[PDB]
Each structure stands twice: as structure tokens, then as C-alpha cells.
Amino acid sequence: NVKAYELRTLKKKELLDKLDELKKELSGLRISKALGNSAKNSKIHGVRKNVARVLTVYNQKRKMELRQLYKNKKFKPYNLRKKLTKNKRLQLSPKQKAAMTLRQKKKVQNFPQRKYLVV
Amino acid sequence: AVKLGAGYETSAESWGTGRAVARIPRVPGGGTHRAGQGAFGNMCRGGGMFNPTKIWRRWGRKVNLKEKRYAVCSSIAASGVTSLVLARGHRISHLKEVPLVVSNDIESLSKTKEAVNFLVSLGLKDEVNRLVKSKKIRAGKGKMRNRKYKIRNG
Amino acid sequence: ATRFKKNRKKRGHVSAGHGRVGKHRKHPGGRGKAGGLHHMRINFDKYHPGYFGKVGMRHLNLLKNRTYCPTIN
């Protein structure tokens, strides 16, 4: 049983090697289960979860190092770029919605709404 | 109100003359218990009530403002006499006068302990006891409708 | 006040006060003002004499604000 923080410092090589040997041990456990042997059947869950953990760490490392590759560059692949709602993606930018012509810009600047009181 | 189409959400058919059965509508099909059973109709099981309750019942009422003011004035006057307050149900046999008034510092006390002490010292110990011991779980289906207890008015 | 309704006091009387011979059918004379001039004519003539026909000219759009005038004696 391996936790997710200590293997966070491994390189991809031994991460994949750990995954491979762990899968091999899981395969051996399944072979034993298929045979008459049943003592080890309860370690299948733990080994399966270890496989899930190491896969999670490896995939997160790969995704982060891929994002570092498309840092800025304005043309990230679709999965790398934002995944908002489709209509949110197609919405006009706040700048575009707030854009105004020079005529109304100078009108607003010269005669803004004013704060005041009464007697 | 009941759900608008309740009991009428089935296919209508009353093939019933010559079938030696009542002319009530029957649900169609087969292979299930419901097939051929009596469909909508107040007499039929699962058939919808006779006059489904509607939300546009006259819930509220309009009361003349003059009549409401008359009623409030009369209620104050009635509270002003001893016999009526006694007959209403309150235990005021130890009150000095029925239209009892207390100094404005009653508006300033802030502890229920001293409020109860003041109420007792006025002679309403019996009234307080009645209110306290009257707490009781009510009868009927009301108590499963967030209406558990029933208290008297002090 | 559904407990004051007259139907409650005919609760075990079979016909519900609507007659044993004539029964309570649904619209046995027609719907609404159906039979005027034909079989409700006596009712119409006895209680609403000048009902049928038309007299006078048409005021196309009235605008009662024009002719509104209250009177004090």
C-alpha cells in the first residue's frame, strides 16, 4: 500500500516501472484467484487502488509538464484551453460588451451621473 | 389542491355494452393487474375525486375596515371588564383590577426570570401555572403536519 | 359553509330533491339563452320585454370622457 505523496517525487521512468511491476503482481493475484487458491483474494483491492494511485500521479505529472510546454503561445490544443460552457465560450468578451464609440465615450466622460443631496 | 390531472392520466375506453360488465371506462391492454380495471370516476379506485380541489377557492375574505375597527374596540372594552376575562378562561381571581396597567419600566426588563416574577407578583401565579401545565401533544393527524403541541392563551 | 347547504338535508332521500319523475338531466332546455323566441319566449317577454331587435344609430367610438358631466341639483 503506497500513498500518493511519497511517489510524487519520482521520475516518469521509475513511476512507470512501479506501475508495471504492480500490474504484474495484480495479474498474479488474479491467476491465483482463478485457480483454487483464495487466501490472497483480499489484496486485490489494495493492489488495484495502488495502481490507480500511481496512474493518477503519472497522469498529473504528464498533464502539468504538457501545460508547461504550451505556456502562453495563444494556440493551446482544445483540451488544454478552457472548458467553460459552450455559450460562455462563445459569449462576447466583457471588453467587447463594454466597448463604446468615441461619441458616447466623450458624452459619458463630460456628463457623468452625479451624486447630490437635498436640503 | 390535488394534482390537476390526477386520476385521469390513462387511456379512456368504456367498451362495456354486451360485455356483461358495467359501462365504466376500463384501462386497455393486458398482462398486468390494471388492464381492464375501472378507470377514472369518483367511484373507481385510483379514479380521481368528485370535484378536484382547485387553488382558486375563495381562501381569504375582505372585511370592512369600519367593522374591523369596531371589533378591535369591542375586544378592548371586553378585556376591560372582570367577568368577561374570568369567563374567557383566565385565573384572575387575585388581580386587583381587570384593566390593570403597570409602570413603563415593564418595557425595559430583559430576563424571562424577572418577567415571570413580575407576573407572579401581580397575582397571576395560577394563570402561569395553567399555561405551563397546559402544554400537551394534540390528538389527530395534525401532529404529523408540524402541529404537535396545543397551548392555552395567557 | 358546506354544512349549511340544503343538499346535506336530503342526504338519504334518493332523488336529492330534484324529483323522481322529471329527474335532474343536464341542460334539458338548452344552454344559456338558447330558447328565446322559440320555447323560452314567454320568459323573455314576461321579464325582459324589449330584448330582441335594435334601435338607434351607432356611435363608432364613444370616448365617454368627452360627454362626462356630473350633475348637482
Binding site: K107, N110, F111, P112, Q113, R114, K115, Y116, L117, V118, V119 | K54, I55, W56 | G32, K33, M40, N43, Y47, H48, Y51, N65, R66, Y68
Partner: protein
Amino acid sequence: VAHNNVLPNVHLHKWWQRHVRVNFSKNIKKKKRRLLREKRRKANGGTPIEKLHPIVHCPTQRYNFRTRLGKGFTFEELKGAGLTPRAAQTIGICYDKRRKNRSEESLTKNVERLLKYKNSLVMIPLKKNKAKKGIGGIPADADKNTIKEFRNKKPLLSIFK
């Protein structure tokens, strides 16, 4: 029909249950509207949320004698108050380009109402102790001391009614 009754007239020959609606939420809506306008006047920082409207004579012979709040002052009365429409709409003055002053009485009375509102105005500087003389007929900005002493005073809403 039978007996001596008015002839029936009920216009319920269509599917009316679809169109029936009952206002269970009249007072709830009242409370919500009051809360919304209270929050508005709390947010705009002491400036009243009402806008000044002229008083006008109701049309037709039926309501000849009665006056009521109209929509917006006209160009003539704004000019008589010395106030361009563009600048007036930024200090809570309603303006409409459709009304015309057909009578000197209406002109003078709306002008004097405008002047009363104007002199009751106390302007808040646009830039936090950068008081200036105003533009387009807007009064000059008040100073820090008078703003301080007037903000705690009850704002009169009589001129709005």
C-alpha cells in the same frame, strides 16, 4: 333560463382554467419591491432615488382641473432654469422632447419648480475635494464642511411629490 333574473352573460365558453391565476404573493411582492428600492437608495449613497418630474394638466374635459406628475421637463423650461437637457438628466431631472409649453402658466410654474429643486440641490464633488463650478447649469460643487453637515440632515422628498 327561468324566473325573473338578468339574462346570463358569462364569457366562460372557452378553456378558462388555463388562464385563471390568483395572486397569493401580493404582499410578498410588496415586501420584495420595498426591499429592492431600499437597497437601491442605500447603495447610491445618500442621493435620492426619485427623479424630479414636472406637474402637468391632465387631458380631456373630464380631468381638466387636475394636475399630476408628467414625464420630463421640456426644453423651454429647462432653458428657463438655465439647464441643458444633457446635464439635467445627470442630476435627477426627467426630460422629454415631446411636450411643448402651450401656456405661459405651465412654463412659469414648471420653471419655478425646477429652480426650487436646483437651489435645494447640494452637489457632491466628482473627485473627492476637487470642487468645481459645474457645467451646463449644474450648480457648483459644495465643500467638505457643508457636505458633512448636510449629509446627516433629513433629505426632503416633498418636491418629488
